[PDB]
Amino acid sequence: HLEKSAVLQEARVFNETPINPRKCAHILTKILYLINQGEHLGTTEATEAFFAMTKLFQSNDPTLRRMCYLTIKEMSCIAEDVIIVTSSLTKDMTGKEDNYRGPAVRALCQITDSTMLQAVERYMKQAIVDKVPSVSSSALVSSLHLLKCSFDVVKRWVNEAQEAASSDNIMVQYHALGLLYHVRKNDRLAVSKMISKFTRHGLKSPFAYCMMIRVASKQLEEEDGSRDSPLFDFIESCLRNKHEMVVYEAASAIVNLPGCSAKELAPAVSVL
Amino acid sequence: MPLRLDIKRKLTARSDRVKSVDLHPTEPWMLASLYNGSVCVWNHETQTLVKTFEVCDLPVRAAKFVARKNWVVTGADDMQIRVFNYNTLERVHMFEAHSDYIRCIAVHPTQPFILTSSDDMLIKLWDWDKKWSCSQVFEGHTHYVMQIVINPKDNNQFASASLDRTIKVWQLGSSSPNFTLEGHEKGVNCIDYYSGGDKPYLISGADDRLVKIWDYQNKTCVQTLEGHAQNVSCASFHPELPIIITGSEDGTVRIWHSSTYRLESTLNYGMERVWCVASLRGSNNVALGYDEGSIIVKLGREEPAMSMDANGKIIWAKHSEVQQANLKAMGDTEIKDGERLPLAVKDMGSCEIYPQTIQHNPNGRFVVVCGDGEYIIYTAMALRNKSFGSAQEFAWAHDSSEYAIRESNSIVKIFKNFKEKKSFKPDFGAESIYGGFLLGVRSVNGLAFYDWENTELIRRIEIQPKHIFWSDSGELVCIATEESFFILKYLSEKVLAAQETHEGVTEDGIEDAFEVLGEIQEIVKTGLWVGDCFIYTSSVNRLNYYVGGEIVTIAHLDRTMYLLGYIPKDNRLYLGDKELNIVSYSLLVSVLEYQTAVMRRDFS
Amino acid sequence: ATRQEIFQEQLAAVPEFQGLGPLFKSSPEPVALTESETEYVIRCTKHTFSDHLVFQFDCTNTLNDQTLENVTVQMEPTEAYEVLSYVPARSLPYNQPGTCYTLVALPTEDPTAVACTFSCVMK
Amino acid sequence: LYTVKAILILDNDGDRLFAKYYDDTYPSVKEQKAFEKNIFNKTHRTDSEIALLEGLTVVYKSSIDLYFYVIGSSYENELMLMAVLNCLFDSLSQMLRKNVEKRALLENMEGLFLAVDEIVDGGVILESDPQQVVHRVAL
Amino acid sequence: MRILMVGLDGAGKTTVLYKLKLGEVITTIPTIGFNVETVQYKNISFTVWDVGGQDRIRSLWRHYYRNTEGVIFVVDSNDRSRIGEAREVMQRMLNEDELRNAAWLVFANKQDLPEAMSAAEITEKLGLHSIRNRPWFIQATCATSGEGLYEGLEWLSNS
Question: What DSSP line would sit under B94-158, residue for residue?
Fold first, then answer.
């Protein structure tokens, strides 16, 4: 339908004095298209782009902002520079809505240098603390890549986790744990306490139940001793739910040739 | 999380609406201004009046101590400034600065200044070295100047609060603020600063019951807080702990954690409204004026949690409220007794639970640490959680292999390796529990002795103490009991027989167990077993060891402190503050021993 | 000249000896000399010969924190053995057997002379 | 937990015009496409409750003229995954208030892209509540 | 007009900038993550690039080109140190050659009590009279006063 080479020259035209928000938006779309189907990439081309993209920033226009994020987001493992961005970044951060902020972290995370990190940590603290989960959620994912990169220092942060540990959004409830597990999973022990930690606890954005299941079993699995008092507690609960899947989840695992307790399983089953 | 914490009703007075309070640090004196019109200065410590002054008899709004200056500053709403040299209370000077109701003074400490805000919609600066010049006048008002606070951090820059709801922060080169921001939706009663230099917050007060946090460097309202029960007369930064003090127009205390931001607690001294507050900069004691009176409370621990391996690493955790993330210290070098030393750097940890106990395993090794009321024990080198649970009270089985617990009921269960030890299971009235070699249950203003395998009331002695330290091998044991102190022998054989015979006294315990050797009437800052030697601190700050019928002071210490640790090999004592400079004084254990043995007739 | 003899020989590649013999029987139980997954983890096996006993020490200097260096093994005895030497595993990195030894010659015709408990300190 | 190995947006005509390979393990753009040929084609114009390819889970919503796909590992929960599968499916649908076609895509190309980023970002599903979303965005 | 305001992070250029621009300032660190800003003055439409110069980028500060036409070069007046020599000359010359197509108006900042060493020596050193060259002004300021600001702009808004 359409072709890259011409476009590659032409994109900079938005960068040419040209005012017509639409035009450029479209052109950007195409680039992304070229890209989406599959595209070579490289530096020179990038660098030239680096000056090109950069001037264009008296835009207020929110949507305009969106577009940017995406593009930048494109550059990550093959990323080029950050300092410019800092100011920019800062701008999202101070930036009123919430929104702006999430995209930026998101590009950042495969790509970056230890160093700055410290600074940006503070920002993290803030994200960590904010009530509109979303951004906070946005924050989290980045970290993972940062874990890719590393994430250990991220570890240091466990504390924040705790302050966070109080949660009330379901999905969100879910997200926290995922991290956590990773964290403690390098560690049996705590977890044992964790269990306890949840033990007082039920779960908000369920999903949480489920990872935990795999988990809850996963210690037990090796013979994290007592199925009996703990496991079972879990099970009645598990059993009970209309989170039929959860019930299942337990059910599926317990595949026991003699029937560990053959009986009950059959009800669950009937139900199945 | 719990109030297993220091709250002390430090000092009380019931009085009037004590509007203002101002602190004398340099000697912990406090100045208070009343709605009576009389102002008084007290030494709280013994509830004693340092001086009182009738400055005016009109309510006296503002007060300062000028410590550097050695004089005390006062103003009443005769619109005059009266000066005393506090070095009597001899009154130096008077003059009329601000001609309207003078609300607040903020002072530059570094630089010789007194800043004032007054209701005249004026802020004037006056220079004391110039002998109360009105050096400069700061204006940019819209109403009475209700409050001035100096950002003392940058003394130099300061912030102003008015109830027309706005805040001007100023630069000297702005006898006007640099800017005004439109804070309140009420009025900005108050402006306050964030203790740390590192980051920057203000809290400002309103009775609207909404709190906004601001970061100056960005220049944002960081966030805005809600939850409240009644018009917050005041809310304050805890400078010691990260907590938020909230205060009300009814004198309600609510605390939100300045980290949890969860209501940690509400307290009622319904002494009505928060008129003033002033805080210890040492961040621990604070006073507020209320109507029915005022109350001052004392809120601190005296230590971090650390325990030292005799290689020479006192591993502590935290610093004061810093993460636990910081333990280590094997050092590497040597220097003179008086002179000071260097540390290593490699944190481990970054716990969450906030402790107040550290205790080593008996081989240093396993520490059990309690905090938030539960016990994390660490595998230390491991940095592993050795284990956890919730406490109430504790004894390691001294041996280094079991432990006991007092459940937040009060009835004993003990665990050795997570096995309850029921061979021993009195559960009598207690007070506290003591482990060691020989079991103490402190009960019924008595201290009662128990076996280690079955309980036995071995003995009961007269009263209760506070603390026990046992000699090392247990043998002669040292119990700290206020002023007074005792040293004892425990004699085994009797028991063995007696036990065999069975028929005994145990109300008293059995009078055929222990003997009372001698007692020193003693006050202990910190204290030590060197073996069975009691090497001790006194809180009178002499470090003495009771030796030979003698108590000798090896040395006397600044003021008294904490016993770093004497790594015997080195024969030295490492002395420890709480501010992480270690001093060492060598002894030589042998000398003591030499003495010990010879008296024993081990002359050779 | 047991299974344990093979061990007498296995031991033999070292030459710092101060007597050996041929192994008679070996350990009825290898002892973990450092308990369960310690900062360093030791399991130890003890070997008897007609002349000497060697304790050869099997192990995974555990923590990746550490590598232990300048390693030798102290043993201090109650019921006889003549104590010839304590062995240093020159270096021990993480998760890894290396060998350290401690050696004794076994007195046989004395009343109380080969069953012993020896006290250990790792340096 | 990084569920989307990849996600593909597909013709009836057995082609893919969007795919974001959440993670690649057999390289190339190319290599993905060959796979399409088998798989899509084969499946084409007809879906499953469940479908598998070799221990991997095969997920996706269709339209008469259009194909939606998500890939994950069949080693795990149908329901949620479905729930998700839908979540997307609906959201967009709802969002669109229309059945995507070939038309839909040309009709506005941008929206896809935009869409694509918000829920899943390379692999995991960040975003959701489609109505919410739908409202949440519009800009 | 892409007008580049140059100087370091830490200068307090930024302080000035928003002092002017917004009326109000910001920290004595010029930017780390840039400024592009637009100002209308005299209703004429201007782009300010403000650089918290910082080295790596400084090296790359050339980094862009197109549509260049005016310089605020902020230099701190009282800067007794980083101002001249190799650095100063180099920067100036390089810039000059590269964009001989734009007037260079140097801004001397925080003059307070001037803590320079001679207004005369420096201007010469910079070869301010190497002039036979593009519209120039040598201009004094201490930020707080803004000791010459409006002319810079004004005189500038000259055609």
Answer: EEE--SS---EEEEETTTTEEEEEETTTEEEEEESTTSSEEEEEE---SS---EEEE-STTTTSE
